[PDB]
Amino acid sequence: ADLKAFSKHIYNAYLKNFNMTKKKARSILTGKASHTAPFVIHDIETLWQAEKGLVWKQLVNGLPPYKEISVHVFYRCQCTTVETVRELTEFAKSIPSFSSLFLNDQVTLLKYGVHEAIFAMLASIVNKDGLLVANGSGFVTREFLRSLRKPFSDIIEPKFEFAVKFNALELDDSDLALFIAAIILCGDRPGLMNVPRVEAIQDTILRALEFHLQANHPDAQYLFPKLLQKMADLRQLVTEHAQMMQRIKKTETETSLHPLLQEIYKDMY
Amino acid sequence: ADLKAFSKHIYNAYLKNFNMTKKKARSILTGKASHTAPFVIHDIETLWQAEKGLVWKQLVNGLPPYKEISVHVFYRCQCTTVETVRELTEFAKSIPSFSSLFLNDQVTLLKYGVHEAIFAMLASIVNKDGLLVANGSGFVTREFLRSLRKPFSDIIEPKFEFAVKFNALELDDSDLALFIAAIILCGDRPGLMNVPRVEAIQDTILRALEFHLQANHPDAQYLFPKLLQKMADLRQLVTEHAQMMQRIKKTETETSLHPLLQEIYKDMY
Ligand SMILES: Cc1cc(Cn2ncn(-c3ccc(OC(F)(F)F)cc3)c2=O)cc(C)c1OC(C)(C)C(=O)O
Numbered sequence: 371a372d373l374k375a376f377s378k379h380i381y382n383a384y385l386k387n388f389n390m391t392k393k394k395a396r397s398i399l400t401g402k403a404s405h406t407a408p409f410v411i412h413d414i415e416t417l418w419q420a421e422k423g424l425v426w427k428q429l430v431n432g433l434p435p436y437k438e439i440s441v442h443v444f445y446r447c448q449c450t451t452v453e454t455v456r457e458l459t460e461f462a463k464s465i466p467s468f469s470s471l472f473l474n475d476q477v478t479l480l481k482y483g484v485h486e487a488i489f490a491m492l493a494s495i496v497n498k499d500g501l502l503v504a505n506g507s508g509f510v511t512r513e514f515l516r517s518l519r520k521p522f523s524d525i526i527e528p529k530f531e532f533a534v535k536f537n538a539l540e541l542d543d544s545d546l547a548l549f550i551a552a553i554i555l556c557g558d559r560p561g562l563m564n565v566p567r568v569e570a571i572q573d574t575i576l577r578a579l580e581f582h583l584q585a586n587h588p589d590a591q592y593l594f595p596k597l598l599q600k601m602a603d604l605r606q607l608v609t610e611h612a613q614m615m616q617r618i619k620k621t622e623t624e625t626s627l628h629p630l631l632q633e634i635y636k637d638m639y
Numbered sequence: 640a641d642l643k644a645f646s647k648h649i650y651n652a653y654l655k656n657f658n659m660t661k662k663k664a665r666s667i668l669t670g671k672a673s674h675t676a677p678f679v680i681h682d683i684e685t686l687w688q689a690e691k692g693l694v695w696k697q698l699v700n701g702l703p704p705y706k707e708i709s710v711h712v713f714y715r716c717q718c719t720t721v722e723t724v725r726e727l728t729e730f731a732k733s734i735p736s737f738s739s740l741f742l743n744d745q746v747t748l749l750k751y752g753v754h755e756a757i758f759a760m761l762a763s764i765v766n767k768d769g770l771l772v773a774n775g776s777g778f779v780t781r782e783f784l785r786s787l788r789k790p791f792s793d794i795i796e797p798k799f800e801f802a803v804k805f806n807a808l809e810l811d812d813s814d815l816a817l818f819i820a821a822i823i824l825c826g827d828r829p830g831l832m833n834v835p836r837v838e839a840i841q842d843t844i845l846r847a848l849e850f851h852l853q854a855n856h857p858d859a860q861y862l863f864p865k866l867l868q869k870m871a872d873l874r875q876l877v878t879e880h881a882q883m884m885q886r887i888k889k890t891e892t893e894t895s896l897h898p899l900l901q902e903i904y905k906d907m908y
């Protein structure tokens with residue numbers, strides 16, 4: 371009660387804001403709802419094919435001018451990330467009392483949380499071998515992404531490592547809704563004004579998550595503490611990511627960075 | 640139709656979000672809605688009377704600990720201003736294409752625009768003699784405010800100086816809606832991401848304003864350039880105000896600043 375309602379409201383916000391759920395993604399990856407697989411990108415040729423219709427169906431990509439394969443893929447990563455951020459902000463608007471914070475605090479929370487949330491949600495569209503892209507019309511292999519030149523392969527691999535370990539907790543969409551809401555409502559964010567309010571909201575979300583997990587996964591007893599540890603793991607994974615991003619900006623000078631990402635990484639830690 | 644439609648929608652946002660319009664204020668200040676005037680505050684006694692129900696109807700002031708009349712009035716100033724910031728934020732959300740900017744840009748625009756807008760709208764509740772407070776239930780005299788000790792009287796007087804000259808343009812609420820929308824949609828704000836989008840929106844607002852002025856004030860010809868100059872004046876007024884605010888923080892160590900105002904003033908330019 372109250373937590374059941376809270377959980378359901380968060381879940382519905384999740385379902386309303388994310389086109390690609392873990393449900394849909396698993397359904398595609400196992401082959402039960404499609405009957406014809408997504409287009410597999412695993413090399414230069416198939417990437418080129420995918421960009422002329424098979425996966426992205428426009429005759430000029432509307433991405434920055436690229437001079438090599440690795441940077442092209444990096445730009446694709448930026449596109450996915452930007453649209454996930456967009457969805458995450460819209461999702462945050464439906465969290466109880468998020469919209470009632472100061473606008474500045476909303477911006478702070480999103481700035482410092484979206485990457486943690488993105489890395490958590492990636493596991494829904496990732497398996498050992500690769501990841502879904504373009505709402506599941508494409509599947510990019512992990513071996514291809516490992517084959518990109520340093521430092522871009524270096525940035526991509528850790529997300530696979532984390533996602534594969536995170537998928538072993540076998541959460542479903544209704545768990546993940548509460549998990550990512552709690553990621554966003556973090557009181558530890560630099561420059562937050564109303565820390566106690568945000569901590570109280572996170573308090574509620576996490577109580578609802580504990581409740582929801584005992585209902586949904588009766589036999590997994592220690593699922594809740596591990597998930598809290600997952601949050602801490604995510605923070606460090608983002609720290610490492612940010613370090614590599616710094617190195618990119620230093621050493622890959624005309625690799626362009628989307629303005630939203632320039633803002634997020636601006637002054638970050 | 641095009642600019643008439645834009646204008647009217649801005650006007651409706653204005654009418655839906657500001658408790659005190661120039662219409663209401665002039666009706667109260669001239670004595671037409673009154674039959675008996677607002678409670679005049681011009682010294683400590685009337686301030687004490689007003690704070691126990693007559694004007695502010697609470698039995699604990701909920702203001703920070705203050706040790707003098709000047710700081711007490713400064714805190715009242717903060718309260719009025721914070722509520723105006725809240726109203727302006729809601730008003731900006733209803734401006735066409737404001738809500739469509741990145742949240743970072745919305746926050747930047749409000750951060751650097753609210754004081755300019757507040758100083759413009761202050762003229763609606765001011766005459767030579769004082770100003771309305773608490774939705775027109777109170778009237779605080781300018782001579783009382785001059786009687787506060789430096790630096791507080793110093794910060795307040797220039798707003799009167801500006802407002803009295805601004806009231807000589809005989810604008811009405813429907814002009815002011817477009818004027819303050821244009822103040823907020825400033826492309827010149829430090830740290831704006833999408834400058835051209837904001838400048839296009841402001842262009843629309845300003846064209847609508849010129850059109851609306853040609854309809855509403857046919858015979859007052861140089862009104863539009865003068866208003867452009869008013870915007871520049873407001874910028875200079877906010878520079879001076881902010882300088883004085885700095886000297887407050889340097890030299891009035893027992894004076895607290897509301898957190899939202901602390902945010903606006905931290906790192907401003
Ligand atoms: C580098 C990065 C990766 C991820 C996850 N990720 N990993 C691979 N892809 C991917 C690969 C190929 C593709 O298509 C095609 F290229 F055609 F193969 C479409 C998408 C992802 O979305 C997440 C964040 C936050 C990243 O950091 C950035 C974006 C820089 C940032 O936030 O600034």
Ligand SMILES: Cc1cc(Cn2ncn(-c3ccc(OC(F)(F)F)cc3)c2=O)cc(C)c1OC(C)(C)C(=O)O
Nearest residue numbers: 680686711712715716717719720772779794795798900
């Ligand atoms: C110091 C200042 C003044 C103004 C205008 N102004 N002048 C007087 N009042 C007022 C006076 C008396 C009253 O009631 C009673 F106290 F009882 F008399 C209630 C309201 C205003 O609102 C505007 C800004 C931005 C100010 O600067 C601050 C707030 C720090 C800031 O930076 O935001």
